[PDB]
């Protein structure tokens, strides 16, 4: 048949499959800086997946600066940057870390605050 060569829409995500989230055993906990318009050291982790086996960097927001996501943490990894564009301040991250989840539930939640959860 006829058509010009159309490419289907591609999410800029190195994990694939048909899965929302993913487990990952982690290497290190980093604290990287950012691009031009904003300062502050923003926290990240080097998540290596089990099923897919890809190296990704993920932003860990939390009300805990040195919150527990260590070297060998079984952390759950979601989207945010898969959904929408990738983040402006600290580029490279396009994955956000989920709280208290997975099989083992090692990575902790937002602490020192007593507004409703999230």
Partner RNA sequence: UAUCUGGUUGAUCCUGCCAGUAGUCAUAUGCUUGUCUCAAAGUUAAGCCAUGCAUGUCUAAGUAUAAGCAAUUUAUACAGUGAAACUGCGAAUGGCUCAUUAAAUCAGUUAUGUUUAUUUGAUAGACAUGGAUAACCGUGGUAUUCUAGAGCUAAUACAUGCUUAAAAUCUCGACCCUUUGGAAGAGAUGUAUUUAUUAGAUAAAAAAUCAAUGUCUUCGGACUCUUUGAUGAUUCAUAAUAACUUUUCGAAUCGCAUGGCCUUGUGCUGGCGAUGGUUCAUUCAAAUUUCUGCCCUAUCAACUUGAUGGUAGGAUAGUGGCCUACCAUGGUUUCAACGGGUACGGGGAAUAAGGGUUCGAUUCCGGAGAGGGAGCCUGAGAAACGGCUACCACAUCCAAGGAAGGCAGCAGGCGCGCAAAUUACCCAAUCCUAAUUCAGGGAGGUAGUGACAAUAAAUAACGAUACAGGGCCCAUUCGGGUCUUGUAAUUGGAAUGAGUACAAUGUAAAUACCUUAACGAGGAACAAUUGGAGGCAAGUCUGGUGCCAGCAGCCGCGGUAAUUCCAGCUCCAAUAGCGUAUAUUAAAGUUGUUGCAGUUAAAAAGCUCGUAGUUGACUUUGGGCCCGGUUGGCCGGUCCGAUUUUUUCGUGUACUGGAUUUCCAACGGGGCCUUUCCUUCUGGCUAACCUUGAGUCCUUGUGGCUCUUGGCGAACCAGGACUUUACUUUGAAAAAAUUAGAGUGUUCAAAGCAGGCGUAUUGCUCGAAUAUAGCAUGGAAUAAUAGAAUAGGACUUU
Partner RNA sequence: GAUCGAAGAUGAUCUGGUACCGUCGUAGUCUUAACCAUAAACUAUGCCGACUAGAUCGGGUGGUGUUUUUUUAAUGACCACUCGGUACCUUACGAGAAAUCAAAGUCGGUUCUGGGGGGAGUAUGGUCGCAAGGCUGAAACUUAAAGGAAUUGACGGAAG
Partner RNA sequence: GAGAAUUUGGACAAACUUGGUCAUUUAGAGGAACUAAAAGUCGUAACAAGGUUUCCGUAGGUGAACCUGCGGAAGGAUCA
Partner RNA sequence: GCGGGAGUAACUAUGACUCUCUUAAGGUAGCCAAAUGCCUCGUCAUCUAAUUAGUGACGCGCAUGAAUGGAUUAACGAGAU
The CB-of-105 to RNA minimum distance in angstroms stands at 6
The CB-of-107 to RNA minimum distance in angstroms stands at 10
Provide the token pair at 13. Answer: 């995500």
CA separation for the pair 62, 44 (Å, rounded): 11
The CB-of-17 to RNA minimum distance in angstroms stands at 7
Query: Toward RNA, which CB reaches closer, 8 or 72?
Result: 8
81, burial (CB in 10 Å: exposed 0-12, middle 13-18, buried 19+) = buried
DSSP for 19-54 reads -S-EEE--S-EEEE---TT--S-EEEEEEEBSSS--
CA separation for the pair 84, 11 (Å, rounded): 9
The CB-of-71 to RNA minimum distance in angstroms stands at 18
């Amino acid at each position: 048949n006829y058509k010009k060569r159309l490419l289907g829409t591609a999410f800029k995500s190195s994990p694939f499959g048909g899965s929302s989230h993913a487990k990952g055993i982690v290497l290190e906990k980093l604290g990287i800086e950012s691009k031009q318009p904003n300062s502050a050291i923003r926290k990240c982790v080097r998540v290596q997946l089990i099923k897919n086996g890809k190296k990704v960097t993920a932003f860990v927001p939390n009300d805990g600066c040195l919150n527990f996501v260590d070297e060998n943490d079984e952390v759950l990894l979601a989207g945010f940057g898969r959904k929408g564009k990738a983040k402006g301040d600290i580029p490279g991250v396009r994955f956000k870390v989920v709280k208290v989840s997975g099989v083992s539930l090692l990575a902790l939640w937002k602490e020192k605050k007593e507004k409703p959860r999230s």
